Design a protein around this nucleic acid. Structure first.
Length: 117
RNA sequence: AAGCUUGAGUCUCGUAGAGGGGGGUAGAAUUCCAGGUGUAGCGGUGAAAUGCGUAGAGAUCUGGAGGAAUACCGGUGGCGA
């Protein structure tokens, strides 16, 4: 109801999907979008554009909270970790900080091995 | 039968290391329990379904624990048969 100018975004991009959540630095979420929830499937569900449209759908949030100043905390290897920021920083918001927060085992317990075809 | 020493070794004073054994306890990440903010998806893939989803998931912030495995330093750098 009142304009507070400030927020923080949490972005995760994988080889199958991309997630974009808008929060306040008090940890409190205000809205979220995904590349799967954008209506995308298969090898296309992770794409830079399926994530770009998810960022445009998320950039409609927080209008009544009047947020413009933005920090971004990024995760995952997926191509969606770039187009999402570019589009959100064009949709009225201004970036001040981008930091990678990918949680990593350093190092244990046995190396991953999956899907051989 | 008896000398000699080069063979082998030890001692004085020093050199180096993820060698082994006994007993402590600490740096994080899967994951799950519990609450705030929050909403309809998440997971897989050439596609998917079982499965997890309003019984409020995933995302975020926080509180917490068992147990396995221990980044950087770390290298033409080392130890053990």
């Amino acid at each position: 109801r009142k304009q507070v100018s400030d927020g923080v975004a949490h972005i995760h991009a994988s080889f199958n999907n991309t997630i974009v959540t808008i929060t306040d630095r008090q940890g409190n979420a205000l809205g979220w979008a995904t590349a799967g929830g954008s209506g995308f499937r298969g090898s296309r569900k992770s794409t830079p554009f399926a994530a770009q449209v998810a960022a445009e759908r998320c950039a409609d949030a927080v209008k009544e909270y009047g947020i413009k100043n933005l920090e971004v905390m990024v995760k995952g290897p997926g191509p969606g970790r770039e187009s999402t920021i570019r589009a959100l920083n064009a949709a009225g918001f201004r970036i001040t900080n981008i930091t990678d927060v990918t949680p990593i085992p350093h190092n244990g317990c046995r190396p991953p091995k999956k899907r051989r075809v």
